[PDB]
C-alpha cells in the first residue's frame, strides 16, 4: 500500500525579477516517507536547500515542503527533481511563475 | 472558537541503512509548534513556532519533560516495529512504517469536543481508540494482538486521561501564549492572472495567497453557472512562512473573459469576494 | 506535552 507523490513548484511571493524570493517544492500524498527532493538552478542541484518536518494527512500520506532562497530573473531556469520508491524514473517539474 | 492539538508520530525501519527512525511533530490547528527527530546525536524536543521559542518562561521544565517523553515514545515504536513485523511474519529485509495521530478538539467553551488516537501500519488503518475512549477497533488479525496487549495493560484509560486532561489544558495554554499566531484569521490576498493560449483561448487563474487557516473555497462561475467540473483546482499548499496558497484556473474563449467571476470564501473575509478580469 | 508511554505498548 504505497502512493506516488504529488509535486507543486512555486515561489513564496509573486516572482518579481531581481527581488529575493523563496523557491518551494511541495511534495504530498506519498507513502512510504523516504523521498529524494532536489531543487535545480539552470539544471544543477542547489546546495543550500532546507525542508519542513515530516508530517502526514488524514489518509496517512506524507507531505514535505522543500525550499531555498532565490532571486528570479528573466532567463534563470528553476526546477524540482523528485524520486521515490513508487517512481521508476525521477519526476522533474519546471518552475513557472504563473503557477 | 474551536481548535485542536494534534501530535503526529512516524516510525520506520531502515534495514541495512541504519537503525529505525522516529519523527514526531505537534500542531495547534494548522500551525506546527514542535518537532523531535531521533536521528540527532542527543535528540531533544525543539520549538517550531515563535510563541514556543520565546514563552517557555511559563514552564521552565517544558523541554526537559517533552524531550524525555519523545525519547520514550521513540523507544516504544522502535520496539513496536519489530512486534508488528512479526505479527505479519514479514521479512526483516523490507522497510516498514508505523504512524500515530492523537490529540483533542476543544469547543468555544474550552471543553473537550472529541479525543482521538489512531494508528496506521504501512499506510493503512491498524488500530484506533473508539469514540467512547474506552475500547479499540483493530483493522485486521495482526492488530488484534496489539489490542489484547493494550486491553491487558489498561492503556485506553491512560490514553483517555491524557486526552481529557493534559491535551485540553495544553491546547488552551498554547492558544493563549500563541494568540498572535493561532487566533489570527488572515484573509487571502486575491487577484486574477491572464495567460493567452492561442488567438482563440486564454487561461484565467484566480489566486488566493497568504491566508490562514488553511480552509478556503475558490470557485469560478460563468454568469451564474458554476464551473467546478471545468476548472483546475490545485491542492492548497504552504507558503513556507506559516500561511497557505491556492489557485483555480479555467480555459475560456478569447473575448469572453468578462463573463467569468472568481468567488473566494475564507473566514478572515468580512464578506466573500468576487473577482472579475 | 507529548503523551508519555509505558515501556513498550505494541
Residue numbers in the entry:
A (entry chain B): 1 to 99
B (entry chain A): 1 to 277
C (entry chain C): 1 to 10
Excerpt from the paper describing this PDB structure:
Major histocompatibility complex (MHC) class I molecules (MHC I) present antigen peptides to the surface of antigen presenting cells (APCs) to active T cells through interaction with T-cell receptors (TCRs), which play pivotal roles in antiviral defense. The α1 and α2 domains construct a typical PBG that contains two α1-helices and eight β-sheets, and the α3 domain and β2m display typical immunoglobulin (Ig) domains and underpin the peptide binding domain.
To verify the uncommon peptide presentation features of bat MHC I, we determined the crystal structures of Ptal-N*01:01 in complex with the two HeV-derived peptides, HeV1 (DFANTFLP) and HeV2 (DYINTNVLP), two EBOV-derived peptides, EBOV-NP1 (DFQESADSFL) and EBOV-NP2 (DFQESADSFLL), one H17N10-derived peptide, H17N10-NP (DFEKEGYSL), and one MERS-CoV-derived peptide, MERS-CoV-S3 (DFTCSQISP). The P1 Asp of all of the peptides adopts a rigid conformation upward to the α1-helix of the heavy chain. Detailed analysis indicated that Asp59, Arg65, and the P1-Asp of the peptides in all six structures of Ptal-N*01:01 form a triangular network of hydrogen bonds.
